[PDB]
Amino acid sequence: HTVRAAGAVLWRDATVEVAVIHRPRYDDWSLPKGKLDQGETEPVAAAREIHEETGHTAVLGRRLGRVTYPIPQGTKRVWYWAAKSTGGDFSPNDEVDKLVWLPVDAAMDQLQYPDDRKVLRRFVKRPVDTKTVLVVRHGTAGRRSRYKGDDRKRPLDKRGRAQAEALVAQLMAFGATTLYAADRVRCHQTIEPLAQELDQLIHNEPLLTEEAYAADHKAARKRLLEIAGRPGNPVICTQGKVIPGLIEWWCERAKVRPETTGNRKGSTWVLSLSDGELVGADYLSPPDEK
Numbered sequence: 001h002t003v004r005a006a007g008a009v010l011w012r013d014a015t016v017e018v019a020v021i022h023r024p025r026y027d028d029w030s031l032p033k034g035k036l037d038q039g040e041t042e043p044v045a046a047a048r049e050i051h052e053e054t055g056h057t058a059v060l061g062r063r064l065g066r067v068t069y070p071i072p073q074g075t076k077r078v079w080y081w082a083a084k085s086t087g088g089d090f091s092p093n094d095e096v097d098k099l100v101w102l103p104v105d106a107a108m109d110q111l112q113y114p115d116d117r118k119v120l121r122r123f124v125k126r127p128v129d130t131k132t133v134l135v136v137r138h139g140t141a142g143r144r145s146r147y148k149g150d151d152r153k154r155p156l157d158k159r160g161r162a163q164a165e166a167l168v169a170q171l172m173a174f175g176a177t178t179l180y181a182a183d184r185v186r187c188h189q190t191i192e193p194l195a196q197e198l199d200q201l202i203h204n205e206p207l208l209t210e211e212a213y214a215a216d217h218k219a220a221r222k223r224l225l226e227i228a229g230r231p232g233n234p235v236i237c238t239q240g241k242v243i244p245g246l247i248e249w250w251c252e253r254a255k256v257r258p259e260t261t262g263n264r265k266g267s268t269w270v271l272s273l274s275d276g277e278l279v280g281a282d283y284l285s286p287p288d289e290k
C-alpha cells in the first residue's frame with residue numbers, strides 16, 4: 001500500500017524567501033504538500049497544493065527528492081519540487097491559517113520537522129532560479145509491424161492521445177513556453193494539445209529523429225544546446241532511441257546525477273539549467289503510470 005503525495009518549496013525574490021505554512025490540524029509549521037487525486041501526476045499535485053494551501057501560482061523547477069512517512073500497512077511517499085511564485089495572494093483556507101515568507105536560515109529554524117529541513121537543504125544545494133528544458137518521449141503509437149505505410153506517419157493510438165492530453169497540465173506545471181518535435185507524426189501529435197493550449201506552433205526537428213541521431217550524435221547534441229540556449233522553457237518531443245544518449249551526454253558534461261531514470265512512452269525529463277549549465281535531470285513517469 002503506497003500512498004502518492006507531492007509537495008513544494010515555494011519561493012520568491014525578497015534575496016530568496018521561502019513560504020512556510022501553519023496548519024491548525026497539528027498546530028505547527030511545514031511545507032505545502034498533499035495526496036494525489038485519481039489520475040493526477042506528482043508535479044500537477046504539487047502545483048495544486050501550492051494553489052490550495054498558499055493561494056499562489058507558481059512554476060515548478062528542480063525536483064528535491066522524496067520523503068517517506070509510515071502509515072498503517074504501508075507508506076506515504078512525498079516528492080518535492082522547488083517552485084517559484086508567479087502571483088496570487090495568501091488567504092486563510094481549510095488547511096492553512098497563516099503563511100510566512102522567510103529567508104532560508106530563518107525558515108530552517110521555523111521548520112521543526114527533520115524531513116522538511118532535509119528538503120530545504122536539498123533546495124539550497126543548487127540554484128533555484130532555473131530555466132527548464134522538457135524532453136518528452138512521444139506517447140503510445142501501436143506496433144510498427146501492424147502499420148504498413150510510411151512509418152514517419154504512424155499516429156498515436158487511443159491511449160497515446162490520452163497521454164498527449166494529460167501532458168498539457170504536466171508540462172504547463174513547469175512553465176513550458178516553446179515547442180519542438182522530431183520529424184515524426186507521433187512526436188508532433190504528443191504535443192499538439194499543448195500547442196493548442198499555448199497558442200504556439202511546433203518547430204520541426206529533423207536532426208532529432210532516431211535515424212538522424214543514429215547517423216550523427218554530434219549534430220543532435222549541438223542542436224539540443226542551440227534550442228536550450230534560447231530564452232524560454234522549450235518542450236522537445238522525440239523518440240526512444242534518441243533520449244537516453246542525449247540525457248546521459250548532458251548529465252556527463254555537467255556532472256549531474258539523475259535520481260530516477262527510465263524511457264517510457266509519454267515520459268518527461270525535466271532538465272533544469274542555471275545560466276546555461278545543467279543542474280538537474282528529473283525523470284517523470286508517463287502521466288497514466290505510477
Ligand SMILES: Nc1nc2c([nH]c(=O)n2[C@H]2C[C@H](O)[C@@H](COP(=O)(O)OP(=O)(O)O)O2)c(=O)[nH]1
Pocket residue numbers: 137140141142143144145210238239240241
Ligand atoms: N527503435 C526502434 N524500434 C523498432 C524498430 N523497428 C521496430 O519494429 N521497432 C519496435 C521495437 C520498439 O520497442 C518499438 C518502438 O515503438 P515506437 O512507437 O516506434 O517508439 P519510438 O518512436 O522508437 O520511440 O518498435 C527500429 O528500427 N527502431
